[PDB]
């Protein structure tokens, strides 16, 4: 049962997902979540495909940048595992 180390495949996935620009969240769940969020604002609202696409690109970019900031917070705290306190600190630093 050859098994790789818990942390080498992590770095390999980091390199793979940093080199590639393919999107990570599937389009259908993100579209459904966008419709769920928007149904509280406007009743019977339609989303064009390019609108959902752009929203997905922006959302993944924001999440990726926040993940780099939380990772930097983790290494700053002499740690490897990110925790929701890192996300809260990163949000509060930018005043979000």
């Amino acid at each position: 049962p050859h098994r790789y180390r818990p942390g080498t495949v992590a770095l390999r996935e980091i390199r793979r997902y940093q080199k590639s620009t393919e999107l990570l969240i599937r389009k259908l769940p993100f579209q459904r979540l966008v419709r769920e969020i928007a149904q509280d604002f406007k009743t019977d609202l339609r989303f064009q495909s390019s609108a959902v696409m752009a929203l997905q690109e922006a959302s993944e970019a924001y999440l990726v940048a926040l993940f780099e900031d939380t990772n930097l917070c983790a290494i700053h705290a002499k740690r490897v595992t990110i925790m929701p306190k890192d996300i809260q600190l990163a949000r509060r630093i930018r005043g979000e």
Partner: protein, 52 residues
């Protein structure tokens, strides 16, 4: 972007190449810092403490 494509050997400019060109130059990095580039990803930077 053409230089980044040369390092990648593709002859066509890709949004990844444009993102690499934007975020590699320092002046372009501070100019376009609050700017999102679609289908661009990020630089493949890994901290030294993460690498074995």
């Amino acid at each position: 972007a053409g230089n980044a494509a040369r390092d990648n050997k593709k002859t066509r400019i890709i949004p990844r190449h444009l993102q690499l060109a934007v975020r590699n130059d320092e002046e372009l990095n501070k100019l376009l810092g609050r700017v999102t580039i679609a289908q661009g990803g990020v630089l493949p930077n890994i901290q030294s403490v993460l690498l074995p």
